[PDB]
UniProtKB/Swiss-Prot annotation:
Phototransformation of protochlorophyllide (Pchlide) to chlorophyllide (Chlide). This is Light-dependent protochlorophyllide reductase. Keywords: Chlorophyll biosynthesis, NADP, Oxidoreductase, Photosynthesis. Its EC number is 1.3.1.33. It comes from Synechocystis sp. (strain ATCC 27184 / PCC 6803 / Kazusa). One of its GO terms (molecular function) is protochlorophyllide reductase activity. The gene is por. Pathway: Porphyrin-containing compound metabolism; chlorophyll biosynthesis.
C-alpha cells in the first residue's frame, strides 16, 4: 500500500531524518544500513513506527554486499518508487588511505562506487514499479568545508583499474579531503549521466540535492572541533548556510515526494530551493568517462 523508498545510510544525520520525514509523509522507508544494531537503536530513540520501516543490511564498501542487499530487498516484494543515495564517509584525520573489501580507496569506494553499482542494479526495480512518478535522488555538492576543489584529471587511476596502491581517481598522491570531494563530484556526474541515458526511455526522475550545511551530523564534526580550538566563540549553528538535521531531512522528503520537484536532470540547492539544470559542456564529457570506467570497476561491463 504505502509507497516505498530506499535510503542508504539512514542510521545517522541526513539519511536518518529523511527517513523520519518520509515516514511522516506516509512512505515505507527501507533503511539500508551497515550497522543493524545502531540503526534499530536510533529508529526507536526517534519513535519510528515499526510498520513504516524495514532495516536491511548494506555495506557500500563491499560490492558483494551491495548485490546481497538488492537480493534481500527483492525478497520483501515491495515495489520501488524512490531511491535516495545518501550514505557517505569522510576521514579528516587520515594520513594513508584505507581500502574497501575490493581494494578500492574507501571514500570513493563507499560514496561513489557502491552507490554506482546500487543505482545500476536498482534501476530495474524502479522500472518495474508501475507508478508514473519515480525518483532517484543523489546527495551531492553545493553547485553543479574543504577548500580543495575536486580534480578527476583524466581518470588515470580509474583507467588503471583503481586497485591499491592506487589511491586517487587521477592516480596522484592520496589526500583524504580531496578524496571526499572527488567522490562527491562523481555522485553529481552520476546524476547527470542517469538523466541523459535513462530519463527519456524510462520516465524516472534523476536529480541531485544539496540540503544545506548540516553541521550537527558527525560527518564534518572534526572540522567544527578544530574551528572551536582556534575560535572559542564558535558554535555549529553559526556556520554559513546552517540547517538543522530535521530540516535537512524534510528537504530530502520534499525532493522525493512533492510535485514541485518533478523535473528530471536538475540539482536542487538551498528559502524555497534554487534549481540548476545539468545541460552540456565540459562536465558532460567527464561524466561519460566517469560512467564508462565505473562500470568496469564494479563489474557491470
Ligand atoms: N553533513 C553536511 O553538512 C553535508 C552533507 N552532505 C551529504 O549528505 C549525506 C549525509 O551526510 P551526513 O548525514 O552529514 O553524514 P552522517 O555521517 O551523519 O551519516 C552518514 C551515513 O552514511 C552511512 N554509511 C557510511 N559508510 C557506509 C557504508 N560503507 N555502508 C552503508 N552505510 C554507510 C553511515 O552509517 P553508520 O551510521 O554505520 O556510520 C551514516 O548512516 C552525504 O552524502 C554527504 O555527502 C552534503 C553536503 C553537506
Amino acid at each position: 500500500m504505502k509507497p516505498t523508498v530506499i535510503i542508504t545510510g539512514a542510521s545517522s544525520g541526513v539519511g536518518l531524518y529523511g527517513a523520519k520525514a518520509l515516514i511522516d509523509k506516509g512512505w515505507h522507508v527501507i533503511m539500508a544500513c551497515r550497522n543493524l544494531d545502531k540503526t534499530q537503536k536510533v529508529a526507536d530513540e526517534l519513535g519510528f513506527p515499526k510498520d513504516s520501516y524495514t532495516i536491511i543490511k548494506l555495506d557500500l564498501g563491499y560490492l558483494d554486499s551491495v548485490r546481497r542487499f538488492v537480493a534481500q530487498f527483492r525478497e520483501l516484494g515491495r515495489p520501488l518508487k524512490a531511491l535516495v543515495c545518501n550514505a557517505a564517509v569522510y576521514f579528516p584525520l587520515l594520513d594513508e588511505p584505507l581500502w574497501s573489501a575490493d581494494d578500492y580507496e574507501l571514500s570513493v569506494a563507499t560514496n561513489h562506487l557502491g552507490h554506482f553499482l546500487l543505482c545500476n542494479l536498482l534501476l530495474e526495480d524502479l522500472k518495474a514499479c508501475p507508478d508514473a512518478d519515480k525518483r532517484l535522488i543523489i546527495l551531492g555538492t553545493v553547485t553543479a568545508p574543504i577548500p580543495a576543489p575536486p580534480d578527476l584529471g583524466n581518470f588515470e587511476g580509474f583507467e588503471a583499474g583503481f586497485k591499491k596502491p592506487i589511491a586517487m581517481i587521477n592516480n596522484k598522491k592520496f589526500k583524504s579531503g580531496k578524496a571526499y570531494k572527488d567522490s562527491k563530484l562523481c555522485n553529481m556526474l552520476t546524476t547527470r549521466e542517469l538523466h541523459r541515458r535513462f530519463h527519456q526511455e524510462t520516465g524516472i526522475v534523476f536529480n541531485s540535492l544539496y540540503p544545506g550545511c548540516v553541521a550537527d551530523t558527525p560527518l564534518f564534526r572534526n572540522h567544527y572541533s578544530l574551528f572551536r580550538t582556534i575560535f572559542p566563540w564558535f558554535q555549529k549553528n553559526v556556520t554559513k548556510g546552517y540547517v538543522s538535521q530535521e530540516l535537512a531531512g524534510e528537504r530530502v522528503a520534499m525532493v522525493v515526494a512533492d510535485d514541485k520537484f518533478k523535473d528530471s536532470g536538475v540539482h536542487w540547492s538551498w528559502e524555497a530551493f534554487v534549481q540548476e539544470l545539468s545541460e552540456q559542456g565540459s562536465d558532460a564529457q567527464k561524466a561519460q568517462r566517469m560512467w564508462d570506467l565505473s562500470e568496469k570497476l564494479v563489474g557491470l561491463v
